[PDB]
Design a protein around this ligand. Structure first.
Ligand SMILES: CCCCCCCC/C=C\CCCCCCCC(=O)OC[C@H](COP(=O)(O)OCCN)OC(=O)CCCCCCC/C=C\CCCCCCCC
Ligand SMILES: CCCCCCCC/C=C\CCCCCCCC(=O)OC[C@H](COP(=O)(O)OCCN)OC(=O)CCCCCCC/C=C\CCCCCCCC
Ligand SMILES: CCCCCCCC/C=C\CCCCCCCC(=O)OC[C@H](COP(=O)(O)OCCN)OC(=O)CCCCCCC/C=C\CCCCCCCC
Ligand code: HEM
Ligand code: HEM
Ligand code: HEM
Ligand code: HEM
Ligand SMILES: CO/N=C(/C(=O)OC)c1ccccc1COc1cc(C)c(I)cc1C
Ligand SMILES: CO/N=C(/C(=O)OC)c1ccccc1COc1cc(C)c(I)cc1C
Ligand SMILES: CCCCCCCCO[C@@H]1O[C@H](CO)[C@@H](O)[C@H](O)[C@H]1O
Ligand code: FES
Ligand SMILES: [Zn+2]
Ligand SMILES: [Zn+2]
Lengths: 380, 80, 295, 147, 61, 379
């Protein structure tokens, strides 16, 4: 059939035509590295994830102590743990850059590849959410309760959905255990979809910073991007290790060093940075149901993005106006994040509602509008 | 097959040299930096503004919060 | 080949067409034309060669009769030594998807007329040989690259060449092929090249030698082809090498010897590449480069 | 880095700080009286260490029994003279022998009858092999470490 | 001419190359740790038990 | 593309693999085990989670949790049975599947085969861990007996073992890591199963006759999709029939006694599907040898392909091989039986023989009777 042995092998033909002979634009930038990073990231979490799971005991009377034992008794246990908890962040960082990139270069015009993306994100989000409960610390516990309790805002069909989800009447063992199972599962489901994600991609190839046919000049993934990719890896892995090796808990709140106690509530209940922006939007709307919706849509909105593209051009590279609107948006998230790490007192609250209000407004009205208006200035 | 069907391209010549024959990170000063600046320059007035415009709100927001904690001596001018 | 030279040497005399620029042809003058002959066509830098039904004597005389103009100074006796040309591992790709087929020339710097290894290098080229769609042996041919070229329809033609210049040379191969088999083909070619430096057998050489022998003998089939050789041999090598000499120089080569010489001029070396036509599949020097080691 | 990270994760699955703690147990050879036996607890299973007077190197060291069903020679892996240490587990179904009475003055596993002499060997009973023998060393006189 | 000599005996054949990395790495480890450990300790002079050990190891009771 | 299942990078995979898939027109019931095996997995995994959601991996709660799962969780007991029995149903199907491929030289599909073998290895390992989970007597001891074999490997034996246990004996450190392993492996199986089906679709199904099917192939749907579902029901029935009327018919009782490292059960014997192997292990008196025999007892499979000499593929037209095949099958039955029995005469001698014949067949008879077979055809 064929000469060499990586095009006629029903296996190497998949380790090749997807990572070595793969046609890649010659001009994609660093914002394209997040792809592989995101992958590598997964490859790692799962691994450290198991390694931990091999020492964990899912039980409201041993969860905390096990995790603790894991750190104090297991060889490099502590190390393995850090890496995992921090791997979580690293994961999100890479995802957010990944996503931003796609938005700033209309990669979302790759509809499928995009929607699979969104799902992947959703799964990742859920995944962490459960993984957080496992150590069963104050925050673990309460974060569970606060969130899961939202579901009870749905009419009729919800007041039940909750007691079903808990396996009881409140977040308790029945929950812990099922969450652990779920946390073991979802990562795999992520890996799965990720495969589908990369497939819909290989159906069109990578979009490039300029937004114009790359066919005129494409390079082989290897060594061009395989090399670039690894450098990209190191340029990140560094701070990831740097923080995780010199400032372990810089990110993680302390109340989670206090064994969960359903009787007493922590002063402030606030998630990990990567959920802050959302938390802030949830808390902006006073009405469990509304806030829930806002939260949902705050992330679900992504699916719409494609249908909200009006520019005759793809990437914002040549569209100054859009660009700043884009950065206004980014900063708009920073704020929401910050607003989320703060209580519910003036000014915060008002600033809160605004930020969220502007968040949607941008992705719903500005972006598509400034896009049209943009088009006419090109005289199209 | 993903290398060949792409597009119809004509009359283009390209010359390149083996890595070994040329320099690793050539003209760091005469070319590199000047562009590193150029790039930086061009974008700053797009990116920076809103980020900066946030630092403010963060500052005012925060700063003003503290202020609302300190007591107002005017509440206590006739508590004899 | 021209493009090949133009990059293989680039910025050197060898990187020039023998037909010259389009401008030059347009403006050269009675003057310069004179000057060339003037400065270039000079006795020491010439060889009167002949072969047929002629006695050296008779000939030699006629020459003594018309090859007059005796040199005064010493400069007119001095054979000008040429400033050497820099080989550069690189490539030049002239794309035209409207071209029916595509041509590809890959090469490495050569040793130069003098160096004996040129013989080995040839014995090598004899092993990879040549092919065009009309060879009859087809799938049974002996040149691995040939056979494959058929098993898979790799190309249209290909050839191994060992151009030798005074102080340098170009060693490589050139194939023509359809826009979609370029790669496989190249791959296989660079491959064979490698095999040369790694697992060449005594069977391959014995055969290559017997081929080369016939090929040398062949260059001397007639009078014209003999004077050519002589005109050359002297001018280039200094003396004149007899089939008896050559042959022995060939009988001396063995597998072991080849793997060493090819290794010397082929293994892990930056090569020159000339792509012309609908070459969207050849791509990346880098890859092409790596194909210069391990096989 | 690779090598390290891998070593790090591999040693991760090996025994942990705690399980390595209950790993070994030591016994003071200068607090055990003649004849009387005292049993401890090791790696879960009890451990026997008795200090025999002198009626065990002359009475149960000369035992004349032809076809022995287990290669137990008192010069292979048995140091201590008036001392004898062995796994407190009957090699049959895992039961635990005794130390008070007995037929051969040794031990006695009331589970199936297997009589164990005062040397750590099966006599009148089914039990295939003889009471498992542990490893140890000698660098501290009034001290012995098993593990 | 180390670069030359290197490219010849070492980085030439993909075999001796690899073989170098192996052995090479061996040396690297063996001596990178020393340096690192040494550096680290120095920056913590007398704080580690490696230092304050002499105060209870064979000098008490 | 015109329709929408050939131009959709997804439906093009739900189609060209289950609907437009070219299938011989003459494959029999011994081809249904493929899908069954699959469906089987789809289920175990599902019931597997459902349980995992109520299990507690701890040498002080494992038993009691499983019990609770049965006594307290809604349909918990049901969900449990199905899983434990699903295990068997799984193996039966695999064994039929395997035999089939032997009797029809499907193993000439080298890759598809080796992947298969691996899949089995994984399944085998998978169960092994799942068994310890309930931490009952058999759970515990089964662990100990087996894991303890590794210590026969000189040097790395002791080392590899204490690493595998996470301690000095099978204890919590183990339980927990086994659970993790049992949660993982099933997925790894699903994974490989994909690759398995791929190498298959590279050649298509082999047919009972062992001759080019190209002359007459039919569309998987509805022909085999229908056949397949029927096949499913004709199996699912006994599977449910036993698991709903005789739950513990298969399972030994010593596993209804919370594990106790101090006391050893009268007889330590695995589930039927490991019996044949158990029997071969104990036939050889020498932990190391018996280990090897066990290993090769299953590893042997990989050789099968390189041990085909007949000029024909399927045994349909080779009477001699057939009986040798059936002698082999029965030869397994025996080994199984021999495994459910102690180590006393006659059993022992019968044991060593059966094992001895097991290898002898796959190693010498089969390849020889094959050659000899060929010459009788005058080839
Ligand atoms: C949601 C959660 C949000 C939490 C905050 C995330 C952390 C925020 C960190 C701040 C990011 C600052 C990055 C500075 C980059 C500056 C820069 O390079 O700008 C110029 C440059 C101009 O590019 P070209 O026009 O193509 O150039 C032509 C060739 N010379 O811009 C870029 O590189 C492209 C922009 C990509 C970066 C986007 C990263 C921001 C991440 C936020 C996620 C947003 C998406 C929506 C998420 C929904 C949930
Ligand atoms: C005791 C310690 C000693 C034991 C060490 C064990 C490890 C053994 C490794 C064997 C060495 C590998 C040999 C590779 C040789 C192949 C080769 O050609 O070079 C690599 C080749 C380069 O090609 P050329 O420069 O053109 O060379 C041509 C030679 N004429 O390919 C590459 O680019 C690969 C090299 C770069 C590696 C980058 C990886 C970055 C990753 C770092 C993250 C850190 C580690 C964490 C691991 C996580 C695992 C869970
Ligand atoms: C290993 C563990 C072993 C445990 C035992 C497994 C359960 C045993 C159940 C008993 C099996 C009886 C099955 C009755 C089948 C009778 C039958 O149909 O025989 C005739 C028929 C003749 O076929 P053709 O010549 O092609 O016909 C021409 C067209 N008319 O034979 C067949 O159908 C093919 C035989 C395939 C069945 C194999 C199933 C036996 C399973 C055992 C596994 C053995 C493999 C080795 C495992 C290593 C571990
Ligand atoms: C589950 C994690 C994910 C992984 C591991 C992943 C991985 C990748 C990879 C390997 C690429 C190709 C290289 C590149 O990054 O450009 C890619 C491209 C892409 N991904 Fe993801 N992705 C993930 C999540 C997402 C998410 C959440 C989105 C956003 C909703 C998304 C949108 C995209 C898009 C639009 C592209 C096209 C890239 C281009 O413009 O060329 N991906 N992804
Ligand atoms: C999708 C990738 C993964 C993400 C995003 C993730 C995230 C997390 C998070 C958010 C925590 C809380 C960590 C903390 O205490 O600070 C956690 C803990 C944990 N995760 Fe994961 N995890 C991932 C994969 C895994 C996998 C695949 C397993 C094993 C199947 C696993 C097992 C555990 C265990 C045992 C804990 C609890 C003990 C601990 O907190 O260290 N994780 N995970
Ligand atoms: C992990 C479980 C497995 C699954 C779910 C699976 C599934 C399948 C499926 C769906 C087929 C196609 C239809 C058919 O059964 O003929 C197939 C074919 C095949 N499998 Fe498996 N298989 C598994 C394990 C194995 C094992 C352990 C072997 C033996 C080492 C094996 C050997 C083969 C062979 C040789 C074929 C070709 C069938 C033919 O002759 O047409 N499979 N398998
Ligand atoms: C490869 C498919 C599977 C096989 C072959 C399998 C087999 C078994 C076996 C052998 C047992 C012991 C049953 C008994 O007590 O009699 C078991 C138990 C169990 N399995 Fe699986 N299992 C599979 C998949 C799963 C999966 C995917 C999970 C979840 C990730 C899981 C979770 C459990 C749990 C919780 C137990 C322990 C409690 C119990 O025995 O009911 N299993 N499994
Ligand atoms: C179990 O609680 N886990 C939490 C966490 O941050 O895990 C990483 C947590 C802790 C304190 C408060 C709220 C949460 C979860 O909050 C979430 C969780 C998800 C999924 C989303 I979308 C959006 C928000 C706001
Ligand atoms: C944890 O022990 N599990 C057992 C079992 O049958 O699980 C389903 C079990 C129970 C009692 C005795 C031996 C075992 C394991 O036996 C095995 C397990 C495997 C893998 C193989 I190859 C071969 C044998 C003989
Ligand atoms: O081979 C087949 O190839 C198809 C297309 O690649 C896949 O969708 C199937 O799962 C695989 O089994
Ligand atoms: S266990 Fe002691 S005699 Fe049986
Ligand atoms: Zn706090
Ligand atoms: Zn029993």
């Amino acid at each position: 059939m064929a000469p060499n042995i990586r095009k006629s092998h029903p296996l190497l033909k998949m380790i090749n035509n997807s990572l070595i002979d793969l046609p890649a634009p010659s001009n994609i930038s660093a914002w394209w590295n997040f792809g592989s990073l995101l992958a590598v990231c997964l490859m790692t979490q799962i691994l450290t994830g198991l390694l931990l799971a091999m020492h964990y005991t899912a039980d409201t009377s041993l969860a905390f102590s096990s995790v603790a034992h894991t750190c104090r008794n297991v060889q490099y246990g502590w190390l393995i743990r850090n890496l995992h908890a921090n791997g979580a962040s690293f994961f999100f960082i890479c995802i957010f850059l990944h996503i931003g990139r796609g938005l700033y270069y209309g990669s979302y015009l790759y509809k499928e590849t995009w929607n699979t993306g969104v799902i992947l994100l959703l799964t990742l989000m859920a995944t962490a959410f459960v993984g957080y409960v496992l150590p069963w610390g104050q925050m673990s516990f309460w974060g569970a309760t606060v969130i899961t309790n939202l579901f009870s805002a749905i009419p009729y069909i919800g007041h039940t959905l909750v007691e079903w989800a808990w396996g009881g009447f409140s977040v308790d063992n029945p929950t812990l255990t099922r969450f652990f199972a779920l946390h073991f599962l979802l990562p795999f489901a992520i890996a799965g979809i990720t495969i589908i994600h990369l497939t819909f991609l290989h159906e069109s190839g990578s979009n490039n910073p300029l937004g114009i046919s790359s066919d005129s000049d494409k390079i082989p993934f290897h060594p061009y991007y395989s090399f670039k990719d690894i450098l990209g890896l190191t340029l990140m892995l560094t701070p990831f290790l740097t923080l995780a090796l010199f400032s372990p808990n810089l990110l993680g709140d302390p109340e989670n060093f206090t064994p969960a106690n359903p009787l007493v509530t922590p002063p402030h209940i606030k998630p990990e940075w990567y959920f802050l922006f959302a938390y802030a939007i949830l808390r902006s709307i006073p009405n469990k149901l509304g806030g829930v919706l806002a939260l949902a849509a705050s992330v679900l909105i992504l699916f719409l993005i494609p249908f909200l593209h009006k520019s005759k051009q793809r990437t914002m590279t040549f569209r100054p106006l859009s660009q700043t609107l884009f950065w206004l948006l980014v900063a708009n998230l920073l704020i929401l994040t910050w607003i989320g790490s703060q209580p519910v007192e003036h000014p915060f609250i008002i600033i809160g509602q605004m930020a969220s209000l502007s968040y949607f407004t941008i992705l719903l009205i500005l972006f598509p509008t400034i896009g049209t208006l943009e088009n006419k200035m090109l005289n199209y | 097959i993903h290398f060949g069907n792409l597009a119809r391209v004509r009359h283009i010549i390209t010359y390149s040299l083996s890595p070994f024959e040329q320099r690793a990170i050539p003209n760091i000063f005469s070319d590199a930096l000047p562009n590193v600046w150029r790039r930086f320059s061009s974008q700053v007035f797009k990116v920076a503004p809103p980020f900066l415009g946030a630092y403010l709100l963060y500052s005012w927001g925060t700063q003003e919060f503290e202020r609302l904690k300190r007591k107002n001596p005017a509440d206590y001018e006739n508590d004899q | 080949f021209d493009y090949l030279h133009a990059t293989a040497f680039q910025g050197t005399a060898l990187a020039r067409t023998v037909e010259g620029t389009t401008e030059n042809i347009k403006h050269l003058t009675r003057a310069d034309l004179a000057s060339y002959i003037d400065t270039h066509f000079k006795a020491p830098r010439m060889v009167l060669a002949a072969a047929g039904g002629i006695s050296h004597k008779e000939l030699v005389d006629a020459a003594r009769q018309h090859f007059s103009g005796v040199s005064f100074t010493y400069k007119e006796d001095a054979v000008p030594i040429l400033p050497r040309c820099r080989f550069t591992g690189s490539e030049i790709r002239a794309r035209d998807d409207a071209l029916p087929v595509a041509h590809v020339a890959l090469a490495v710097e050569g040793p130069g007329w003098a160096d004996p290894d040129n013989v080995v290098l040839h014995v090598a080229n004899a092993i990879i040989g040549r092919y065009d769609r009309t060879f009859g042996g087809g799938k049974h041919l002996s040149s691995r690259l040939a056979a494959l070229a058929v098993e898979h329809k790799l190309c249209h033609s290909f050839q191994t060449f060992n151009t030798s210049y005074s102080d340098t040379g170009l060693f490589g191969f050139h194939f023509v092929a359809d826009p979609l088999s370029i790669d496989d083909m190249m791959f296989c070619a660079q491959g064979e090249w490698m095999r040369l430096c790694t697992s060449t057998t005594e069977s391959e050489v014995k055969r290559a030698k017997n081929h080369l022998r016939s090929a040398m003998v062949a260059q001397l089939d007639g009078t014209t082809p003999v004077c050519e050789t002589i005109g050359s041999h002297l001018l280039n090598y200094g003396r004149r090498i007899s089939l008896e000499e050559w042959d022995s120089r060939i009988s001396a080569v063995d597998a072991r010897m080849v793997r060493d010489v090819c290794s010397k001029y082929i293994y892990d070396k930056c090569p020159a590449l000339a792509a012309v036509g609908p070459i969207e599949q050849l791509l990346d020097y880098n890859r092409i480069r790596s194909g210069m080691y391990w096989i | 880095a690779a090598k390290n990270v891998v070593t790090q994760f591999i040693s991760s699955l090996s025994a942990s700080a705690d399980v390595l703690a209950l790993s070994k147990i030591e016994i003071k050879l200068s607090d055990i009286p003649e004849g009387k036996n005292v049993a401890f607890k090791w790696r879960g299973k009890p451990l026997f260490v008795r200090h025999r007077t002198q009626a065990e190197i002359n009475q149960e060291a000369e035992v004349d029994v032809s076809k022995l069903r287990d290669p137990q020679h008192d010069l292979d892996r048995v140091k201590k003279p008036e001392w004898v240490i062995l796994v407190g587990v009957c090699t049959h179904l895992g039961c635990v022998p005794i130390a008070n009475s007995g037929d051969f003055g040794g031990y006695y596993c009331p589970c199936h009858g297997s009589h164990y002499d005062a040397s750590g060997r099966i006599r009148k009973g089914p039990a295939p092999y003889n009471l498992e023998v542990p490893t140890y060393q000698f660098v501290g006189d009034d001290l012995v470490v098993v593990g | 001419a180390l670069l030359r000599q290197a490219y010849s005996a070492l980085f030439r054949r993909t075999s001796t190359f690899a073989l170098t990395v192996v052995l090479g790495a061996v040396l690297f480890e063996r001596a990178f740790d020393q340096g690192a450990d040494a550096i680290f300790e120095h920056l913590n002079e007398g704080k580690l038990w490696k230092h304050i050990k002499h105060k209870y190891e064979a000098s008490e009771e």
